[PDB]
Design an enzyme around this catalytic site. Structure first.
Site, PDB file in Angstrom:
ATOM      1  N   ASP A 228       0.066   1.804   5.780  1.00  0.00           N
ATOM      2  CA  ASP A 228       1.775   1.779   4.985  1.00  0.00           C
ATOM      3  C   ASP A 228       2.358   1.981   6.327  1.00  0.00           C
ATOM      4  O   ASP A 228       2.001   2.596   7.675  1.00  0.00           O
ATOM      5  CB  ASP A 228       2.283   2.498   4.096  1.00  0.00           C
ATOM      6  CG  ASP A 228       1.743   2.941   2.448  1.00  0.00           C
ATOM      7  OD1 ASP A 228       2.088   3.728   2.340  1.00  0.00           O
ATOM      8  OD2 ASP A 228       1.372   1.416   2.174  1.00  0.00           O
TER       9      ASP A 228
ATOM     10  N   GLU B 273       5.607   3.578  -9.485  1.00  0.00           N
ATOM     11  CA  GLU B 273       5.604   1.913  -9.666  1.00  0.00           C
ATOM     12  C   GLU B 273       5.561   1.828 -10.850  1.00  0.00           C
ATOM     13  O   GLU B 273       4.498   1.596 -11.551  1.00  0.00           O
ATOM     14  CB  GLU B 273       4.252   1.798  -8.802  1.00  0.00           C
ATOM     15  CG  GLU B 273       4.691   1.806  -7.276  1.00  0.00           C
ATOM     16  CD  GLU B 273       3.303   1.898  -6.284  1.00  0.00           C
ATOM     17  OE1 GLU B 273       2.976   1.953  -5.334  1.00  0.00           O
ATOM     18  OE2 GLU B 273       2.272   2.455  -6.948  1.00  0.00           O
TER      19      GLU B 273
ATOM     20  N   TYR C  77      -4.379  -1.973  -5.776  1.00  0.00           N
ATOM     21  CA  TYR C  77      -3.179  -2.837  -6.419  1.00  0.00           C
ATOM     22  C   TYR C  77      -3.684  -3.978  -6.828  1.00  0.00           C
ATOM     23  O   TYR C  77      -4.868  -4.659  -6.551  1.00  0.00           O
ATOM     24  CB  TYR C  77      -2.400  -2.885  -5.211  1.00  0.00           C
ATOM     25  CG  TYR C  77      -1.382  -1.024  -4.873  1.00  0.00           C
ATOM     26  CD1 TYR C  77      -2.308  -0.159  -5.302  1.00  0.00           C
ATOM     27  CD2 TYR C  77      -0.013  -1.497  -4.775  1.00  0.00           C
ATOM     28  CE1 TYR C  77      -0.445   0.872  -4.552  1.00  0.00           C
ATOM     29  CE2 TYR C  77       0.768  -0.656  -4.125  1.00  0.00           C
ATOM     30  CZ  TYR C  77      -0.126   1.067  -4.645  1.00  0.00           C
ATOM     31  OH  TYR C  77       1.112   2.039  -4.602  1.00  0.00           O
TER      32      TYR C  77
END
Length: 658
Positions: free
Chosen positions: A232, A503, A615
């Site tokens: 990230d 999320e 993800y």
């Protein structure tokens, strides 16, 4: 060249198959290639597929092996006790187990090249490692080899690393076949790649897939093109896009939706060793977490993403600062000039850099690309490149001049080092993207920006309303537009979590009724409902029957267009595991018309419970198939950082899921 040995249909049922008399006297010279087509949908924890060993007493560590773990890891050992050599090369998340209820035939290609002193492994067309050594050990030059074995390694007369699986085909060559030759070997892959190492992005890594079906029938995907390994932000990351006009069968060469040029677009093999793997590009600006929606009225495709200034990510972002100054109800982007310790400047109308301390406009302007001009003349900075040539990460000027951007390290005027949201639009359904524009703050001047929920926005079926879910401390913050993304308002929905990565993805159960599914810290996926098109939101409930880890994983969700068992259907995509980001599932839920409750009736296993799944993005393809683009690995594990070509695409039909 022709194989020196070729065999087929071997069943590995926890009993080794001895191929010594067929192979051993055929091995000659210092270079070899192994081609192996095999299945393993119920593997043991650690198992050897192929072995060459000295099986004699006192030489238990004289062997070559191709091994796999039930995590999906593949590797080799090349060992010779006399030579003092013990090579172990491997990569996590290299294999497929099952697809549509059937064992996947993996295609493994291992090249042992004596000329270049390099061992290279390919699985399913993907290079998973290539290792150069100073002292080469030819695989058949191990001292005292006397066994060739399938489904185990014979050590001191006994079967070690017994395998469960099958090898439909195994071939060996007394040559190191070239990469060109490798690419000619037929594959039986259950997946495709949309984004991949060596493509137009020149990013060696990808994370955070999205998918969205456009009204034309075109299917669009966005993604983090991550350059500095899979980290990230802080890093170098761009937002890349690709589209398919044939229901996902083929995909366009990627382009950028959002990009920064302060650092070069470099394809870098990021170190995976324990000393260096945490190395992070620390001076680059970046984008992170994209989301896509289509606007009915305008026909525009809209893409949002977080924006991070140079050196910035979630971990070091200024909290309690939006990066904007409110002046009589209006928000203006703040700037700090070199030499000043404070932010004395704002960007007013028409990009005019205005001095707040002296209340005078300067001779500087900021253009639409967030670039610095002085008296109309474009200012520049020198681009950086990165390398590990010196044994650690180095970030240095590369001689190339690029437009000075206020998000850059070397810029004369700098934005507040905090997180932002930007939006871009496409008027040609992803063939090109407009210059992005920052979104204003929604929770005040002294509150840092919210974090965009990656995946899809929501376009309400019976209105012009567009919604993007975001999250921050204590709430989901929905961004609502009724005018094609020209203006946005917020709708806050409290959640009982402090500082969570919540999320969230939305489905429209029926007209104006929205259910949002979201990541939590409880080990359960949560949901809330709005019955007024996102104006107000219910309290939080939790889904039973699906497990997540304590830290959680993004969940993707869609409202399917067709009835299933005579009922309206919702499809969720998530790992189903309390241990890691593995055991990926598509869960089919049937809506109860009486109370909008959902019966989670079918759970489709994407692959093995033990194989990685993080993800994900799902979309209903125009033909009613389901497209899934997903991280096929544990993107949380510190053991599975910096893997290439693990974000993969598959096509499913409803009958596969039920």
């Amino acid at each position: 060249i022709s194989p020196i040995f070729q065999g087929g249909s071997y069943q590995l049922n926890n009993k080794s198959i001895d191929i010594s008399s067929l192979l051993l006297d055929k091995l000659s010279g210092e270079s070899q290639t192994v081609v192996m087509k095999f299945k393993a949908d119920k593997p043991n924890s650690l198992q050897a597929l192929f072995g060459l060993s000295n099986s004699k007493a006192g030489f238990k560590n004289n062997y070559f092996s191709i091994f796999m773990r039930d995590s999906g890891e593949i590797g080799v050992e090349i060992r010779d006790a006399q030579k003092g050599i013990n090579y172990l090369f491997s990569r996590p998340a290299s294999l497929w187990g099952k697809h549509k209820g059937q064992a996947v035939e993996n295609t493994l290609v291992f090249v042992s090249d004596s000329k270049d002193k390099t061992y290279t492994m390919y699985v399913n067309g993907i290079e998973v490692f290539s290792e150069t050594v100073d002292t080469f050990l030819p695989i058949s030059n191990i001292n005292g080899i006397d066994k060739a074995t399938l489904g185990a390694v014979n050590r001191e007369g006994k079967e070690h690393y017994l395998a469960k699986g099958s090898i439909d085909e195994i071939s060996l060559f007394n040559k190191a076949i070239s990469d060109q030759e490798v690419s000619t070997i037929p594959l039986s892959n259950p997946f495709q790649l949309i984004f991949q190492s060596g493509d137009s992005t020149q990013a060696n890594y990808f994370r955070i897939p999205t998918l969205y079906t456009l009204s034309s029938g075109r299917v669009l995907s966005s993604i983090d093109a991550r350059y500095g390994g899979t980290h990230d932000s802080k890093s170098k990351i761009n937002i890349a896009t690709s589209y398919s006009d044939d229901n996902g069968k083929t995909w366009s060469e990627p382009i950028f939706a959002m990009k920064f040029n302060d650092y070069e677009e470099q394809l870098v093999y990021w170190p995976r060793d324990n000393k260096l793997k945490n190395s992070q590009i620390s001076g680059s600006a970046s984008f992170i977490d994209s989301s896509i929606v289509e606007d009915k009225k305008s026909g525009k495709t809209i893409l949002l993403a977080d924006v991070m200034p140079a050196g910035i990510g979630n971990n070091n972002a200024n909290k309690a600062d939006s990066g904007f100054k409110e002046i009589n109800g209006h928000y203006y982007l703040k700037l700090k000039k070199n030499g000043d310790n404070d932010f004395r400047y704002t960007v007013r109308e028409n990009g005019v850099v205005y001095n707040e301390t002296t209340n005078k406009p300067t001779n500087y302007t900021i253009n639409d690309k967030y670039e610095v001009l002085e008296g109309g003349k474009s200012l520049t900075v020198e681009q950086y490149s990165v390398d590990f040539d010196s044994g650690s990460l180095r970030e240095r000027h590369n001689g190339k001049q690029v437009p000075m951007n206020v998000f850059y390290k070397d810029s004369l005027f700098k934005v507040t080092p905090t997180n932002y949201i930007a939006m871009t639009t496409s008027q040609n359904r992803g063939e090109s993207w407009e210059q992005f524009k920052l979104l204003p703050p929604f929770l005040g001047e002294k509150h840092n920006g919210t974090y965009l929920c990656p995946g899809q926005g929501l376009a309400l079926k019976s209105s012009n309303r567009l919604i993007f879910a975001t999250y921050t401390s204590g709430e989901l913050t929905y961004l609502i537009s009724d005018d094609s993304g020209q203006t946005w308002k917020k709708s806050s929905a409290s959640i009982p979590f402090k500082n969570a990565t919540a999320e969230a993805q939305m489905v429209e159960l029926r007209d104006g009724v929205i259910r949002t599914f979201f990541r939590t810290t409880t080990g359960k996926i949560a949901y809330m409902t709005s019955r007024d098109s996102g104006e107000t939101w219910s309290k939080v409930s939790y889904i039973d029957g699906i497990q997540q880890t304590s830290y959680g994983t993004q969940v993707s969700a869609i409202k399917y267009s067709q009835l299933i068992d005579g009922k309206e259907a919702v499809i969720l995509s998530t790992p189903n595991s309390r241990s890691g980001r593995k055991g990926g599932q598509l869960v089919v839920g049937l809506v109860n018309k009486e109370d909008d409750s959902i019966d989670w009736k079918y759970h489709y296993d994407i692959d093995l419970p033990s194989y990685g799944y993080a993800y994900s993005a799902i979309t209903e393809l125009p033909n009613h198939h389901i497209g899934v683009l997903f991280e096929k690995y544990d993107s949380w594990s510190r053991n599975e950082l910096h893997l290439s070509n693990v974000v993969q695409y598959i096509d499913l039909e409803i009958n596969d899921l039920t």
